[PDB]
Amino acid sequence: FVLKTPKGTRDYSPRQMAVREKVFDVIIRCFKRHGAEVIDTPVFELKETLMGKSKLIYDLKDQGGELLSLRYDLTVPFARYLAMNKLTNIKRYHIAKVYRRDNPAMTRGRYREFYQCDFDIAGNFDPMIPDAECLKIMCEILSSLQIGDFLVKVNDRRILDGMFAICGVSDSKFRTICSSVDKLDKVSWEEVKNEMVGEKGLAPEVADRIGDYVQQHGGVSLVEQLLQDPKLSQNKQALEGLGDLKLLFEYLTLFGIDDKISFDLSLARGLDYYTGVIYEAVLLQPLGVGSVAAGGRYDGLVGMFDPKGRKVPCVGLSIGVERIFSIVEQRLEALEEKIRTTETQVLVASAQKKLLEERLKLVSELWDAGIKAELLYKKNPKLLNQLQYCEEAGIPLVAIIGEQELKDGVIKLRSVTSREEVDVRREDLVEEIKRRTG
Amino acid sequence: AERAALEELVKLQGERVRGLKQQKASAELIEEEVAKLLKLKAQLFVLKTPKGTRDYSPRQMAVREKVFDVIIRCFKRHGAEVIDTPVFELKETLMGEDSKLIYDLKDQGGELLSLRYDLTVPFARYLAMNKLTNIKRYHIAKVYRRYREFYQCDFDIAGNFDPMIPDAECLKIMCEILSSLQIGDFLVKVNDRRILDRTICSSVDKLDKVSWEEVKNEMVGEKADRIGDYVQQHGGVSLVEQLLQDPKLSQNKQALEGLGDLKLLFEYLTLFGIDDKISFDLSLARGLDYYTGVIYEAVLLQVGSVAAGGRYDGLVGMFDPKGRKVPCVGLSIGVERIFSIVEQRLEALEEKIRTTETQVLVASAQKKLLEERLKLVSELWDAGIKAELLYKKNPKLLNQLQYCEEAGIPLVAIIGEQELKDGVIKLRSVTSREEVDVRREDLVEEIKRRT
Numbered sequence: 001f002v003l004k005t006p007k008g009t010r011d012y013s014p015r016q017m018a019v020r021e022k023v024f025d026v027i028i029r030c031f032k033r034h035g036a037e038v039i040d041t042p043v044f045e046l047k048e049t050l051m052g053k054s055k056l057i058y059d060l061k062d063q064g065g066e067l068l069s070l071r072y073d074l075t076v077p078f079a080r081y082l083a084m085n086k087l088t089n090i091k092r093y094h095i096a097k098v099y100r101r102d103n104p105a106m107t108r109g110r111y112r113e114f115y116q117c118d119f120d121i122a123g124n125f126d127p128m129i130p131d132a133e134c135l136k137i138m139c140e141i142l143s144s145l146q147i148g149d150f151l152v153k154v155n156d157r158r159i160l161d162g163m164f165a166i167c168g169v170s171d172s173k174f175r176t177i178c179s180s181v182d183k184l185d186k187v188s189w190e191e192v193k194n195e196m197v198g199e200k201g202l203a204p205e206v207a208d209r210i211g212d213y214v215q216q217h218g219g220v221s222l223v224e225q226l227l228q229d230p231k232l233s234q235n236k237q238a239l240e241g242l243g244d245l246k247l248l249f250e251y252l253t254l255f256g257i258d259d260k261i262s263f264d265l266s267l268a269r270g271l272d273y274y275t276g277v278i279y280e281a282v283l284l285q286p287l288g289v290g291s292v293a294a295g296g297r298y299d300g301l302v303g304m305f306d307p308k309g310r311k312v313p314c315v316g317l318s319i320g321v322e323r324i325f326s327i328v329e330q331r332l333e334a335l336e337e338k339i340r341t342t343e344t345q346v347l348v349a350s351a352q353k354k355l356l357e358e359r360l361k362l363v364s365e366l367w368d369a370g371i372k373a374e375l376l377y378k379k380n381p382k383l384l385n386q387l388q389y390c391e392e393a394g395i396p397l398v399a400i401i402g403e404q405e406l407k408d409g410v411i412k413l414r415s416v417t418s419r420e421e422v423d424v425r426r427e428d429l430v431e432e433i434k435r436r437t438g
Numbered sequence: 439a440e441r442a443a444l445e446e447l448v449k450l451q452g453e454r455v456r457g458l459k460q461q462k463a464s465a466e467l468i469e470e471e472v473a474k475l476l477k478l479k480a481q482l483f484v485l486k487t488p489k490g491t492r493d494y495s496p497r498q499m500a501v502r503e504k505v506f507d508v509i510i511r512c513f514k515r516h517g518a519e520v521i522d523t524p525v526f527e528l529k530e531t532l533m534g535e536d537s538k539l540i541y542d543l544k545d546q547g548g549e550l551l552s553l554r555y556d557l558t559v560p561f562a563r564y565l566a567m568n569k570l571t572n573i574k575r576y577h578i579a580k581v582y583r584r585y586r587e588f589y590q591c592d593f594d595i596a597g598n599f600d601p602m603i604p605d606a607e608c609l610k611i612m613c614e615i616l617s618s619l620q621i622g623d624f625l626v627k628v629n630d631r632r633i634l635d636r637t638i639c640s641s642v643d644k645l646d647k648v649s650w651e652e653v654k655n656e657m658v659g660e661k662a663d664r665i666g667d668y669v670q671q672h673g674g675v676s677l678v679e680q681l682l683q684d685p686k687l688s689q690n691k692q693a694l695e696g697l698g699d700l701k702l703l704f705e706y707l708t709l710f711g712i713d714d715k716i717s718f719d720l721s722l723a724r725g726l727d728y729y730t731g732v733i734y735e736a737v738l739l740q741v742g743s744v745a746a747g748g749r750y751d752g753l754v755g756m757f758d759p760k761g762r763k764v765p766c767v768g769l770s771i772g773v774e775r776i777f778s779i780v781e782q783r784l785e786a787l788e789e790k791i792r793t794t795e796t797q798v799l800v801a802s803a804q805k806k807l808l809e810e811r812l813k814l815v816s817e818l819w820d821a822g823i824k825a826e827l828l829y830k831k832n833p834k835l836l837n838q839l840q841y842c843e844e845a846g847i848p849l850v851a852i853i854g855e856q857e858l859k860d861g862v863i864k865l866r867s868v869t870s871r872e873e874v875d876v877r878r879e880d881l882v883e884e885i886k887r888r889t
């Protein structure tokens with residue numbers, strides 16, 4: 001028996017926490033900027049609640065009591081929360097860890113316990129305003145994180161259904177074909193066409209029509225082009241999706257995030273789940289380095305719990321904080337710069353021995369002034385040792401107490417980086433420290 | 439949800455009333471508490487959260503954010519790092535209260551796992567795994583026991599340092615957070631395990647709750663004269679000094695060592711200025727098994743415990759193959775009861791508790807200005823202002839104003855055709871109902887100044 005974190009789980013070191021706090025602050029400042037509420041659900045539900053949901057779910061031991069399970073997803077707790085509280089409309093964000101028992105590849109992003117970061121608007125509202133807002137929120141956060149240039153792919157579920165029927169895929173092969181088409185971002189169309197015809201028996205005359213549609217990406221001008229398409233115009237659901245899309249593009253143009261959006265018909269994810277617009281956010285090297293965010297409209301899923309069977313229309317977005325965390329730390333790592341694990345702005349030190357009690361008095365005053373102060377728990381620490389500690393922790397200043405300095409009543413402040421000393425009056429010292437550090 | 443919070447409030451009120459009656463409190467205060475409790479009671483498929491677990495409502499979250507914010511600022515002020523641990527650990531990792539209390543996962547077809555029951559065992563594992571002999575950190579996370587699922591707030595300092603400074607700092611931090619919380623007057627009681635050196639201890643812990651007389655009878659039932667004199671006595675530094683002078687305690691080295699450390703600790707507290715708020719009691723024996731040094735427990739002044747902790751050197755050593763002990767001192771803050779006390783206090787003021795921070799809402803009385811509204815709101819968002827708008831083509835102005843009143847939003851931005859033409863925007867204070875015309879450019883700056 002080795003002491004280890006469970007297979008698939010990880011601790012978070014102070015540096016990692018600092019990185020995770022830095023990004024969570026940006027994302028939540030944006031969520032609050034859009035006037036969202038926040039909720040929290042327990043880490044486990046009753047099993048009854050999750051059965052019928054891929055059954056890679058951790059389950060607690062019976063232990064006499066009724067069976068329970070760690071949440072594998074945020075939304076089913078969301079639906080339970082809305083049905084339990086008799087609400088059909090709410091705007092909120094939930095940030096919390098989820099638990100799926102799957103093989104974990106550390107090199108790969110996969111981990112058994114990982115953060116999920118969701119923002120949702122639920123309710124019957126005029127069409128597309130909430131969706132446009134969701135898109136704006138995605139671009140705000142990714143732009144603010146400064147992790148390079150991003151682009152957002154959007155599509156619609158209805159267009160996929162209509163385009164696939166008109167092109168000529170059967171209904172039960174349709175999900176499999178979609179799984180193939182979605183890889184066009186990471187692979188080539190000759191390759192997914194070979195995969196489709198060869199591995200899944202789809203006719204080449206149906207694959208080479210799906211090709212003429214899916215290899216097509218652009219802006220609003222492509223929704224107009226496809227509105228003009230004779231075959232597509234005939235299809236009703238394709239018509240619905242395109243109409244919603246034309247409207248969405250207009251709202252984004254008002255938002256000013258129009259340039260960073262791309263209509264792309266290759267995109268096909270979460271079909272079981274999404275009923276309207278589907279969007280994915282990816283980093284740019286015009287080549288995507290990975291998928292950083294996702295969003296969708298899922299009217300069907302939220303209302304499952306209600307006895308009546310009423311559907312609560314919902315639109316939302318999920319942010320891949322776990323890639324964002326790694327990318328941010330590596331950027332720091334590439335620089336090779338040390339990351340502050342503490343916010344201490346001053347350290348109290350005395351060169352001379354026997355001044356420990358006085359320092360304690362000084363440190364307390366700083367604490368009661370709301371200053372982030374520290375001191376070494378040694379009766380007579382050496383000045384050199386104290387300074388090294390400051391350099392390592394990134395502490396900007398050192399406050400030195402000396403018998404000579406004390407008589408004057410002044411306190412000597414030395415900048416660690418510049419190694420320059422100034423003598424300050426005790427009353428002023430607090431304000432001097434404040435001026436020095438925000 | 440909200441109903442669940444109400445139930446929690448009722449459970450706390452009942453406990454408080456029970457404590458007050460026990461303390462032989464005056465009728466005037468007891469009646470007020472009963473009145474609050476009665477009001478709470480009045481206020482109070484098969485979809486349900488698992489037993490012992492409750493959801494957090496937006497209103498509930500707001501109280502939690504404010505409370506956590508105060509605690510977090512204090513921890514940061516004292517220059518602590520922060521660490522995170524997974525929810526579950528190997529069952530073997532958690533081992534010698536009762537083993538059965540701990541939650542355990544199904545076999546699955548992998549190593550057996552159990553949910554964290556405490557936040558410090560994982561910390562001990564973290565230290566051993568990384569081989570660290572010194573760290574100052576705080577950890578805020580949910581713990582599971584079989585409410586069964588609840589938040590735990592912990593601040594710990596681990597390492598070898600001159601005696602009593604780390605211990606003194608924890609008390610100062612605890613006092614600092616409680617005063618900041620503004621939950622009223624509180625006191626902290628401190629004892630050392632070494633000086634104290636089972637069933638008597640439990641009786642002793644039970645002793646805090648009940649009188650010595652009845653308390654004395656309980657001890658007899660459990661079966662004392664020598665023991666009784668020591669337990670009743672409690673106080674300050676002067677009281678501490680008298681005990682050392684005693685010959686019996688004095689001639690025992692094990693007993694003697696603890697007394698000396700405490701004497702030293704009080705001096706540090708005096709420098710800090712939290713000396714007045716510290717109390718010495720030998721009666722306290724809570725968390726005796728974990729502790730190898732001092733005990734401290736905080737009690738608010740009208741379980742009844744808001745904060746607790748002490749020095750334990752035994753745990754870090756257990757994980758290490760070598761078994762070398764790691765000195766450590768720490769504190770836990772009972773943040774759930776603090777949640778419900780804070781929310782209750784806010785309610786007394788009668789001031790609204792806002793679930794959102796939106797500064798302003800964009801609204802238009804007239805028809806067909808939706809696009810105009812969207813552009814403006816977007817500009818506000820870009821500016822970093824917290825703004826909203828209703829997802830309606832032509833919403834009515836009265837409806838929008840009502841939403842602001844209910845949501846607590848301070849201002850409403852109104853767009854009119856004439857206003858649009860002149861370059862002005864009409865800003866109306868929801869509370870005052872007063873209006874002003876502000877040019878588009880000045881709108882962002884003015885909103886910030888007003889808020």
Ligand SMILES: [Cl-]
Nearest residue numbers: 176178179180
């Ligand atoms: Cl596949």
Ligand SMILES: [Cl-]
Nearest residue numbers: 007547548549
């Ligand atoms: Cl396994």
